[PDB]
């Protein structure tokens, strides 16, 4: 199916405390495989998956050399944005950056991403066509014009459309055992009693990969947008994911409600009903 | 692998 490689970068200024914090993390789909931490002792790009450890020394020296240049660039950008917005040197500010590429089942280029945020807000993003930018505000138009004159987008295309896909193919192959697997959700159900008449039903989906999933509550009948509790899909910590959906129902109609689980690993949607 | 091209805002 579809796959993706994304790198997430976070820079946080710390005036009066020291250099800005810098964190880089790289993902293939919902699996992290590398990190760089300015506050760590190694000061190198570090493996975070077993299938990336097989890379030779030249790979880690290169990623180290590149990611430290990223670190230096966001360090400069923090000061530039402070000027663009005429902010004081006292407060702490955050720069976030994400880029990468998607591929389809054929592992061919599908989409490319390259976008920034300042203090949690969109600042400038590369458009889907990979040739123009979206400036969130008047201040970001200064960056937009700068990057248009320097033909940044044209130069980025080779990486997003080409090199990014080449990397992703390599990783998918070297980590076939884990990256290309599919774990179907293990489903069960629980019954909780709100006082007297009303009760809650919870649908559980556990130990599934990838994290993509949908849980819907059927009454009679069909879905219930109202009175449906849906927690964010969370990581189990062992490479799989968890999620549950809950509905509030009067007692005695438990048999009327049914849970629908759709996951990539499931041959067909699962339907759960009380009790078990 | 990450970008080798660095540029400033």
């Amino acid at each position, epitope marked *: 199916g579809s796959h993706s490689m994304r790198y997430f970068f976070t820079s946080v200024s710390r005036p009066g405390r020291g250099e800005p914090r810098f964190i880089a993390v790289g993902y293939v789909d919902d699996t992290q495989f590398v990190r760089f931490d300015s506050d760590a002792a190694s000061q190198r790009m570090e493996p975070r998956a077993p299938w990336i450890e097989q890379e030779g020394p030249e790979y880690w020296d*290169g990623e180290t*050399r*590149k990611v*430290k*240049a990223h670190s*230096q*660039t966001h360090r*400069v950008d923090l000061g530039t944005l402070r000027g663009y917005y005429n902010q004081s040197e006292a407060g702490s500010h955050t720069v976030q950056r994400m880029y990468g590429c998607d591929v389809g089942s054929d592992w061919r280029f599908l989409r490319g991403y390259h976008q920034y945020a300042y203090d949690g807000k969109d600042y400038i993003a590369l458009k889907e066509d990979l040739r123009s930018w979206t400036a969130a505000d008047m201040a970001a138009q200064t960056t937009k014009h*700068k990057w248009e004159a*320097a*033909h*940044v987008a*044209e*130069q*980025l*295309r*080779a*990486y997003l459309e*080409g*090199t*990014c896909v*080449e*990397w992703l193919r390599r990783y998918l192959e070297n980590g076939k055992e884990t990256l290309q697997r599919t774990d179907a959700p293990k489903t069960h159900m629980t019954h909780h009693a709100v006082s007297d008449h009303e009760a809650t039903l919870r649908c559980w989906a556990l130990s599934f990969y990838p994290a993509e999933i949908t849980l819907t509550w059927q009454r009679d009948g069909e879905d219930q947008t109202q009175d449906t509790e849906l927690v964010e899909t969370r990581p189990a910590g062992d490479g799989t994911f968890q999620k549950w959906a809950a509905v509030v129902v009067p007692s005695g109609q438990e048999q009327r409600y049914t849970c629908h689980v759709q996951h990539e690993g499931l041959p067909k949607p699962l339907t759960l009903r009380w009790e078990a | *692998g990450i*970008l*080798g*091209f*660095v*540029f*400033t805002l």
Partner: T-cell receptor
Amino acid sequence: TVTQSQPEMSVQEAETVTLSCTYDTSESDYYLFWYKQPPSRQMILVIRQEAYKQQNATENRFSVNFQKAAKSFSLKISDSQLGDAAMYFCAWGVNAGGTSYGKLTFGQGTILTVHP
Amino acid sequence: GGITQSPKYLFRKEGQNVTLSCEQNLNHDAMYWYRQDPGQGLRLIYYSQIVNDFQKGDIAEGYSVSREKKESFPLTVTSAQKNPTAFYLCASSIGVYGYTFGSGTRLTVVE
């Protein structure tokens, strides 16, 4: 490596001359350049080419023949003028995914003499 | 805007250190130093993609650079550089675009 096999070359004014350049690399995408350095020693960019893109241009006399499979990036000077007397350098560079962006690796160069 | 290199001509006594200046107001992030020798093309010495970032070329030994400011990228030819007689060219760019070279500098060793 970038190889320019002809250290010197001569052309008669108003005629045309072809400067050869061949390169070796494993990268799928990259950049190819031709630079002109007249007696002033000032480097002047003649043409840049990206492997992804297609041969394009030119409005001017200068032109290139880019053979991706053959790895040939020859520069063609037509209707040679006396001002074309200069040293012409072929150069290569990685794309944005490479570690040494944007370091240029230069050939040995070709001195072009224009006979009036 | 442009890039200004200096000095145009210059000589070094053996055992002497010397510095070449390079300034650019093109708002370019990257700056480079190249060395030109007859029978050879241009060979990269040093380059700085951004302030306080330094990447050595294959012939970096005997040379040193500093990038305290965006606009300046001075090159120092230390006495340790065994055979420094050559033509030195500063350069500036943003990636592979806007690539511009300076006027150039000629350095001679006067024993």
